[PDB]
Design a binder for this molecule. Structure first.
Ligand SMILES: CCCCCCCC/C=C\CCCCCCCCCCCCCC(=O)N[C@@H](COP(=O)([O-])OCC[N+](C)(C)C)[C@H](O)/C=C/CCCCCCCCCCCCC
Ligand SMILES: *[C@@H]1O[C@H](CO)[C@@H](O[C@@H]2O[C@H](CO)[C@@H](O)[C@H](O)[C@H]2NC(C)=O)[C@H](O)[C@H]1NC(C)=O
Ligand SMILES: *[C@@H]1O[C@H](CO)[C@@H](O)[C@H](O)[C@H]1NC(C)=O
Ligand SMILES: *[C@@H]1O[C@H](CO)[C@@H](O)[C@H](O)[C@H]1NC(C)=O
Lengths: 271, 98
């Protein structure tokens, strides 16, 4: 089904002489690449991180990114130089680029840029453009950037062609990981806030979708409060669902967990 | 500038005497510069693994720290974070029997 491929670039500029750029790459919720500032080469975080690209195809792609990383750092430091004292140090820039894959052979690509934690610029169609409400000083530099037809053509190639092409290959090569099923383990505890908060912990499941509910018999307890999905370090998930209960009303309560890995055999724990 | 949120949780059901992993997940912060410590009875834990820093759809950063641990009845664990958004470090204690 739906897979989003995200290349995430994080650049920090503290002053004229200190900057660092680190990147991570995700296919859905699995990390496929890491590119540390103090590494010349992009590192694989899966056996299949090269997808179906040949070594030569990968080397070509990497060299382009290596040139880009140095170029981006110079260009920004020069943009800041010609921007004193409009918006000075420290400066944080983030870039999020990739493509969302859909059933069939369809996809949509994106390239978004944030400045000081705020979305300011996208590449759209054939050009860089500032988003409504972005700082006005960005207008001229984006027009300058748009005059670089070489960069524009390359970005168009990367979004329109290279992204979906690479991802199709990742999806084939990474099949056993992407389609892995890991079983949740659940346990019950309580924490403060007479009322107590009952906690159903669900951990070690993959993929992400999961159903967790407090129950009294067949009755779903609508007081059930599901937290956020929290990552474990072993590419599985953690979630808890809580229920605030009056003292002496705990008896008869159960936590029921449904997950794809369990094949219809729900976990049921009784308080 | 955005304040980090901190969530502390074990990988497995906590059993005293049984090896486990404690997670400290730090989210929603900006700028990306941050110091994360995991603590055992108020003392810094030396061997703490950090994930690569990443960021979410809303552009806020996140990172996972984790450490191997064997729960006992009396040991208390916490995660302490220093960040420019806060004048004081923020500490969150592991919940188990709280
Ligand atoms: C994208 C999916 C492709 C699939 C590949 C998957 C593998 C990924 C592994 C690691 C990826 C690492 C993450 C990188 C993020 C992707 C970035 C894509 C861009 C590539 C461009 C290449 C061309 C190039 O590098 N462009 C630069 C260098 O050009 P050049 O003239 O020196 O020559 C380059 C070669 N070329 C072929 C002739 C173009 C050019 O100078 C723009 C650089 C700046 C562009 C960013 C500007 C954004 C605006 C920010 C302003 C707002 C902030 C405020 C500032 C104060
Ligand atoms: C990449 O795809 C985009 C569409 O997503 C193409 O942009 C279109 O280009 C034509 C002429 O170049 C314009 O008339 C359209 O308005 C553009 N569409 C949008 C949505 O802006 C672009 O040409 C493609 N680039 C390459 C190299 O194939
Ligand atoms: C620039 O910032 C870095 C990182 O904070 C710092 O270590 C360095 O001293 C700064 N350099 C100057 C010249 O101020
Ligand atoms: C990041 O990498 C660049 C390019 O090699 C290097 O010059 C710079 O000193 C690095 N930044 C830090 C903070 O180490």
């Amino acid at each position: 089904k739906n897979y989003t491929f995200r290349c995430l670039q994080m650049s920090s500029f503290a002053n004229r002489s200190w900057s660092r750029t680190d990147s991570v790459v995700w296919l859905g919720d699995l990390q496929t690449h890491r590119w540390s500032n103090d590494s010349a080469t992009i590192s694989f975080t899966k056996p299949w991180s090269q997808g179906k690209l040949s070594n030569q195809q990968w080397e070509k792609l990497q060299h382009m990114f290596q040139v880009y990383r140095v170029s981006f750092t110079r260009d920004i430091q020069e943009l800041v130089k010609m921007m004193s004292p409009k918006e000075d140090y420290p400066i944080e820039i983030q870039l999020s680029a990739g493509c969302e894959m859909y059933p069939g052979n369809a996809s949509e690509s994106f390239l978004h840029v944030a400045f000081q934690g705020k979305y300011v610029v996208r590449f759209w169609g054939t050009s860089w453009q500032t988003v409504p409400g972005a700082p006005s000083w960005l207008d001229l530099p984006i027009k300058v950037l748009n005059a670089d037809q070489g960069t524009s053509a390359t970005v168009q190639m990367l979004l329109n062609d290279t992204c979906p092409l690479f991802v199709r290959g990742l999806l084939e090569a990474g099949k056993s990981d992407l389609e892995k099923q890991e079983k949740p383990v659940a346990w019950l505890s309580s924490v403060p806030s007479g009322h107590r908060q009952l906690v159903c912990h669900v951990s070690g499941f993959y993929p992400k979708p999961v159903w967790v509910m407090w129950m009294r018999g067949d009755q779903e307890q609508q007081g059930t409060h599901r937290g956020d999905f929290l990552p474990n370090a072993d590419e599985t998930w953690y979630l808890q669902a809580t229920l605030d209960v009056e003292a002496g009303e705990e008896a008869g309560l159960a936590c029921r967990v449904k997950h794809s890995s369990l094949g219809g055999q729900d976990i049921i724990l009784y308080w | 500038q955005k304040t980090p949120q901190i969530q502390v949780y074990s990988r497995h059901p906590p059993e005293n005497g049984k090896p486990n992993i404690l997670n400290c997940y730090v989210t929603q912060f900006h700028p990306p510069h941050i110091e994360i410590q995991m603590l055992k009875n108020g003392k810094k834990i030396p061997k703490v693994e950090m994930s690569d820093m990443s960021f979410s759809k809303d552009w806020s950063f996140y990172i996972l720290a984790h450490t191997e641990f064997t729960p006992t009845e009396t040991d208390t664990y916490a995660c302490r974070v220093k960040h420019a958004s806060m004048a004081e470090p923020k500490t969150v204690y592991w919940d188990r029997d709280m």
